[PDB]
From Swiss-Prot:
Description of post-translational modifications: The full length protein appears to be cleaved into a 120 kDa precursor. This precursor is then proteolytically cleaved at the N-terminus generating a 96 kDa form which is further processed at the C-terminus into 68 kDa and 35 kDa forms that remain associated.
Its EC number(s): 3.4.11.-
Binding site for a peptide: 124, 265-266, 268
Activity dependence on pH, as recorded: Optimum pH is 7-7.5. Active from pH 5 to 9. Has less than 20% of normal activity at pH 6.0.
Site feature (Important for substrate specificity) residues: 264
GO biological process, one term: proteolysis
Further details from the record: May have an additional translation initiation. Translation initiation at the first Met codon would generate a form that contains the signal peptide, enters the endomembrane system, and ultimately reaches the food vacuole. Initiation of translation at an internal Met codon would result in a form that lacks the signal peptide, thereby re-directing the protein to the cytosol. A nuclear localization signal would then lead to nuclear import.
First and last residues shown, out of full length: 196 to 1085 of 1085
Function: Displays aminopeptidase activity with a broad substrate specificity. Preferentially, cleaves after Leu and Met, but also cleaves after Ala and Arg. Low activity towards Lys, Phe, Tyr, Trp, Gln, Ser and Gly and negligible activity towards Glu, Asp, Pro, Ile, Thr, Val, His and Asn. Has dipeptidase activity. Plays a role in the terminal stages of host hemoglobin digestion by cleaving the N-terminal residue of small hemoglobin-derived oligopeptides.
GTP-binding is among the record's keywords: no
Family, similarity comment: Belongs to the peptidase M1 family.
This protein's name: Aminopeptidase N
Sites annotated Cleavage: 600-601
UniProt key word Repeat: no
Length: 890
């Protein structure tokens, strides 16, 4: 396979200054004429001029109006256009091409494609070369003049990046529009859209300069009503970047566009952000609660890229985390400010420690700045995004808000209008660090290891208290497991946010402080500590590590009840759960492998269950927090702690633990399910698409979590509650009623009821598909076959394919059926999908990432299916790289 290496980066011998495009859309072809105003750089050594250009049909090629001919002045192999050096000018020149492309048959959704009746582009990372020839890499920055023409009746709205500078009629019922984007950009930020789109709009006046910005949000006509929350989220986003970062929008217009067929969530094209409809459109009658948070986050994310990615862009794709880690950090700051709920940060932590930790212990483990790739699309990973965001957040923890803001400013201003690298960012932060420490010899050179070193650090603790001296110590050790990226691991700069809790009275004993661990081990000592404390470690989850708290369950309970920090309370709960899960898993595993006729299980700690009851019954405690405490850790979290995992033993373990606790708490759960109803399902704001009460949303999640626990328990007469809950106006409730009805004969009646409620809204139907797919049904395989035949059919819409299959892959007992039939089913879907959408196919590989964690029978079954997929003729480069790396062949 062709591999690209970070260390091999070199500036191009060429410069592209201006791009002038004419994109003429017809029924059965689109013609792209492009003029590149180019020059020779100071790095040129008289090389051939080589353009990327994938699957283009050439009409004409010229330089300075000299026609060039195949085999004489150029070669084209359907991937690269090589202009031989003799015909490459030595000073500024005009390169002209005209090619034919076919959006109507572009089911890969990269380049120019058709999504329902909308023509749309996606260029990040390497899609622009599927539209026209280019030196398609992000250091080739240029200015764009784009004309789009099409049939006026079919495609009345025409958009490209920047200012609309003309609109005109064309004979034969056609029309055109011309766009000028005055901001230099890499080609991955080009976009065009053509469609019968409807819109909502508003005017926003910037905070400092008072610039009037016109905000447009667009969709197909059927769904225009569902645009309102996205428009509000955009205004919130603009105001947050102004308020926190001093950053104002930099064009007279910003358009957001929803399309039905999109490989990811959205895309930050300059002035023209394009979204998966699932991440832009909602209405309260037709969307689950989680859509609201998703839209806030995705709108914010793409908006924040306007500076962290667009105004400062990437030198090369190895630097991806510079824009994604940083942008995810910005959107997390924004969403924590907008939602004002502790469960927002907790959800980010849960994501990282489940999916990203799994990745980082897998054969796919990479640092957040990778050293090599075949298909850059395979490095848009939870590592680069989520570990990247945590590395970007640690700078704020280390510097505090004022100095973080100063370092950020240094970065964004120095590199404005240009490319940057991870080093540039670290250097700006280092400037702020010198200022914070008032020491111009302090440096963050060690910090760079967070970019280059793979794997998750493990941080462990020991404690000592001297009662006579009133002195306490915390001894800390870090360890990162060697891997294929580094045989020798180095210690990182790990910021440890800490408090100390008095176990007598539950009160804070120190001003919170952040310990700066830089060595492999260190001991931090505290004086004037009046009683032996319980330490509250890694507050806010202050580094992306495995924490070994070395606390007793009694200590953990006291923190769960009394600490101030949400994360530590939740983590202490998590750790009590983990200790139980491991112990019970081992007891079940021994019983199974020894074929014992009887054995013991360690019961769940009774004082821990009392603590759960105390928290749930506290009318002043947080509803979202409560839903985290009654839930066991995610299976993908748990699997980071078990080698040769027998999935069926794990399912048995979880069931036992849940049943132990419900046998004590089900009456509390039922009482709370009823008591929370009035506030949870109050209809304030039900007609207001500009406002969401996230606390109320958390109350609904708590109610629906409790209902699931009581339904699996078969709590007496709970089917009555299930039927009532199905009549709620909130889709989060009525779809929950379907899921929880899985344990009852009413399942298929609720399946039909909710289908009918869902079938006339594209996105609600996809949410119904996910609800079915995730259902805890013994007959899940027959239900999946029913979904395939009656609803999915031959959809190539990634959202439909993902909705049917991915939730089912999270079914621990059924997806991991020892026959291998779940592995075979998903491998067939992957291979089917790879023939038209390689990116989606690689997404659908997700459940195989943990293969080498499983028991050896399931390792074998998984490996057989991965090798079967690797044998498939015409396998994509995306899938082949992914599977070769995952199976230890690359
Ligand atoms: Mg083609
Ligand atoms: Mg993105
Ligand atoms: Mg459809
Ligand atoms: Zn992004």
């Amino acid at each position: 396979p062709k591999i690209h290496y970070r260390k091999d980066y070199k500036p191009s011998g060429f410069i592209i200054n201006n791009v002038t495009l004419n994109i003429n859309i017809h029924d059965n072809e689109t013609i792209v004429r492009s003029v590149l105003d180019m020059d020779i750089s100071k790095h040129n050594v008289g090389e051939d001029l080589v353009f990327d250009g994938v699957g283009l049909k050439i009409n004409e090629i010229s330089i300075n109006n000299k026609k060039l001919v195949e085999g004489e002045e150029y070669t084209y192999d359907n991937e690269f256009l090589t202009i031989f050096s003799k015909f490459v000018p030595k000073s500024k020149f005009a390169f002209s091409s005209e090619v034919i492309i076919h959006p109507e048959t572009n089911y890969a959704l990269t380049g120019l494609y058709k999504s329902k009746n909308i023509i749309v582009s996606q260029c990040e990372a390497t899609g622009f070369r599927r539209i026209t020839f280019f030196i398609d890499r992000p250091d080739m920055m240029a200015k764009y003049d784009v004309t789009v023409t099409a049939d006026k009746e079919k495609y009345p709205v025409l958009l490209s990046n920047g200012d609309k500078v003309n609109e005109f009629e064309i004979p034969g019922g056609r029309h055109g529009a011309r766009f000028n984007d005055p901001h230099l950009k890499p080609c991955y930020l080009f976009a065009v859209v053509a469609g019968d789109l409807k819109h909502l709009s508003a005017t926003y006046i910037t905070k400092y300069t008072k610039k009037k910005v016109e905000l447009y949000v667009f969709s197909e006509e059927k769904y225009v009503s569902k645009l309102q929350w996205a428009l509000e989220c955009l205004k919130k986003s603009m105001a947050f970047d102004e308020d926190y970062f001093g950053l104002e929008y930099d064009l007279s217009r910003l358009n957001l566009v929803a399309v039905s067929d999109f490989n990811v969530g959205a895309m930050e094209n300059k002035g023209l952000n394009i979204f998966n409809a699932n991440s832009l459109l909602a209405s309260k009658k037709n969307s689950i609660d989680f859509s609201y948070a998703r839209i806030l986050t995705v709108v914010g994310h793409e908006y924040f890229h306007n500076y962290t990615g667009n105004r400062v862009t990437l030198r090369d794709w190895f630097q991806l985390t510079l824009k994604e880690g940083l942008t995810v950090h910005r959107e997390n700051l924004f969403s924590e400010e907008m939602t004002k709920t502790v469960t927002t940060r907790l959800s980010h932590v849960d994501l990282l420690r489940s999916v990203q930790f799994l990745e980082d212990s897998s054969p796919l483990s990479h640092p957040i700045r990778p050293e090599s790739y075949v298909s850059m699309e395979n490095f848009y990973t939870t590592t680069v995004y989520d570990k990247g965001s945590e590395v970007m957040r640690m700078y704020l923890t280390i510097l505090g808000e004022e100095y973080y803001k100063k370092g950020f400013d240094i970065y964004i201003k120095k590199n404005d209008g240009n490319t940057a690298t991870c080093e540039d960012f670290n250097y700006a932060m280092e400037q702020a660090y010198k200022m914070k420490k008032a020491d111009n010899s302090a440096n963050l050179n060690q910090y760079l290891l967070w970019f280059s070193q793979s794997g998750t650090p493990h941080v462990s603790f020991k404690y000592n208290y001297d009662a006579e001296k009133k002195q306490y110590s915390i001894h800390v050790n870090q360890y990162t497991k060697p891997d294929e990226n580094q045989k020798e691991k180095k210690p990182l700069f790990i910021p440890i946010s800490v408090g100390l809790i008095n176990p007598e009275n539950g009160k804070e004993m120190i001003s919170q402080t952040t310990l700066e661990l830089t060595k492999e081990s260190d001991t931090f000592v505290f004086n004037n500590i009046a009683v032996k404390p319980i330490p509250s470690l890694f507050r806010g989850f202050s580094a992306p590590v495995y924490i070994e708290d070395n606390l007793t369950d009694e200590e953990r309970i006291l923190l769960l009840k009394y600490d101030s920090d949400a994360f530590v309370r939740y983590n202490s709960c998590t750790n009590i759960y983990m200790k139980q899960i491991l112990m019970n898993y081992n007891e079940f595993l021994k019983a199974k492998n020894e074929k014992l006729e009887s054995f013991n299980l360690t019961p769940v700690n009774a004082q821990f269950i009392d603590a759960i009851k105390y928290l749930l019954e506290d009318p002043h405690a947080d509803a979202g927090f409560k839903s985290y405490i009654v839930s066991l850790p995610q299976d993908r979290y748990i699997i980071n702690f078990v080698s040769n995992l027998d999935t069926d033993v794990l399912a048995d373990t979880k069931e036992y633990i849940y049943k132990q606790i419900g046998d004590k708490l089900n009456d509390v759960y039922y009482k709370m399910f009823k008591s929370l109803e009035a506030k949870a399902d109050d209809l304030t704001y039900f007609n207001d698409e500009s406002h969401v009460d996230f606390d109320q949303m958390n109350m609904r999640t708590l109610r629906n979590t409790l209902l699931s626990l009581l339904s699996k328990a078969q709590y007496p007469n709970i089917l009555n509650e299930i039927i009532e809950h199905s009549k709620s106006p909130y889709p989060s409730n009525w779809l929950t009623s379907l899921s929880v009805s899985a344990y009852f004969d009413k399942y298929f009646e609720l399946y039909d009821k909710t289908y009918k409620l869902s079938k006339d809204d594209e996105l609600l139907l996809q949410e119904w598909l996910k609800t079915v797919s995730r259902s805890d049904r013994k007959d899940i395989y027959e239900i999946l076959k029913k979904l395939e035949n009656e609803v999915l059919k031959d959809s190539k819409n990634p959202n439909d394919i993902r909705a049917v299959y991915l939730p089912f892959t999270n079914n621990l007992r059924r997806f991991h059926d020892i026959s291998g039939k779940g592995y075979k089913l998903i491998a067939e879907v992957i291979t089917k999908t790879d023939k038209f959408n390689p990116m989606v196919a690689t997404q659908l590989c997700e459940p195989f990432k943990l293969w080498n964690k499983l028991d050896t029978k399931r390792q074998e079954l998984m490996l057989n299916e991965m090798n079967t997929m690797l044998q498939e003729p015409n396998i994509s480069n995306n899938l082949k790289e992914y599977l070769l790396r995952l199976t230890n062949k690359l």
